[PDB]
Structure 1
Amino acid sequence: ESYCGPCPKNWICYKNNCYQFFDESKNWYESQASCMSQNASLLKVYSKEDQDLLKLVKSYHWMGLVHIPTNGSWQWEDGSILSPNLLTIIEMQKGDCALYASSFKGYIENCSTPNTYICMQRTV
C-alpha cells in the first residue's frame, strides 16, 4: 500500500515492520531493556526477503539472538528458534549473545560488552 504499517512516532518503517537504531553503547541486557522500554525487542531476523533492507546496515549492532547452553542452539529473545538458512553465525568474542552484521551475519560477543543496538516490532 501507499502507507506503511503501525509504528512508533519517528521510527523506520519497511514492509510493515518498524526499526530504530540507538547510538548509545550498552550491554545486551541493558539493550534488551532499552527495547522493552518502548514495547519492542532486539532485532529479530525471520525473512531475508521481508527484511531485505538489512543488507544496507553499516557496522555491527546488538541483535536479540541468545544462546542456551543446556541444549546448544541459538534462539530469539522471545522464544522463537532461529530458522535455518537465515544467519551465518561467526565466533568473534567468547560469549552467549550475538551482534548483527550486513548480509545476514551474526557475530558472537560477550553480552557484557557495550555496543549499539537495533529495536524492532512486528505487525500482527
Structure 2
Amino acid sequence: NQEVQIPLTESYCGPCPKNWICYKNNCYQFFDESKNWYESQASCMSQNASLLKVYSKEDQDLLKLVKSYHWMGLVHIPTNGSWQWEDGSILSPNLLTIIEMQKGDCALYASSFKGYIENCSTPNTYICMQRTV
C-alpha cells in the first residue's frame, strides 16, 4: 500500500517530453536561454507546453527548491485589476506572494511560491510545464 516505498509501489511517471522532470502527473523543464516573456511563452508552446502555472503547494512542492528567478505563465490585466494564468484561470489565493520589483505586467517565479513583478521585455530564464494524461 501507500505508507511504504518498495519496488512493488513504484510506477512510471508521464507521459512527458524526452528528458523532462516528471512529478505528480506534471512535466517541467528549465531553459537557461534568457528570453522575454513573449519569446518564453512561444518557446513553451512550440514544445506543446505552457509557462509554469502554480495551482497547488502540495502537488508542486518541488518549486520550493528552485534557485534564481524564472518566467512563469502569470500576467496582469489592468481592466479587472488582477493576475491570471495563460489558460485564463484565476490565481488562487494563498498560493503566491506577489512582490512589486519592477513596474510590469508579467511575473518571475522564485522559491518559495513567490512572484516578482518584472518588465515583460526583460530577458529571463523560464520554466515550461505540461500536464500529463
Pair in the same fold by TM > 0.5: yes
Shift of 1:3: 1.2
List alignment gaps of at least 5 residues for structure 2. 1-9
DSSP 3-state at the match of 1:80: coil
1:7 paired residue number? 16
List alignment gaps of at least 5 residues for structure 1. none
Shift of 1:2: 1.6
How far apart, CA to CA, are the structure 2 residues paired with 1:98 and 1:47? 17
DSSP 3-state at the match of 2:120: coil
How far apart, CA to CA, are the structure 2 residues paired with 1:7 and 1:65? 22
Tell me which protein shows more strand as a share of its residues: 1
Deviation track 1:19-65 (CA, whole Å, cap 9, x = no partner) reads: 00000000000111000010100000000000010000000100100
How far apart, CA to CA, are the structure 2 residues paired with 1:47 and 1:33? 24
Shift of 1:123: 2.6
Shift of 1:5: 2.1
Identity of aligned residues (%): 100
Shift of 1:16: 1.4
Larger radius of gyration: 2
Q: TM-score, normalised by structure 1?
A: 0.97
Runs of 4+ displaced beyond 6 Å = none
Q: TM-score, normalised by structure 2?
A: 0.91
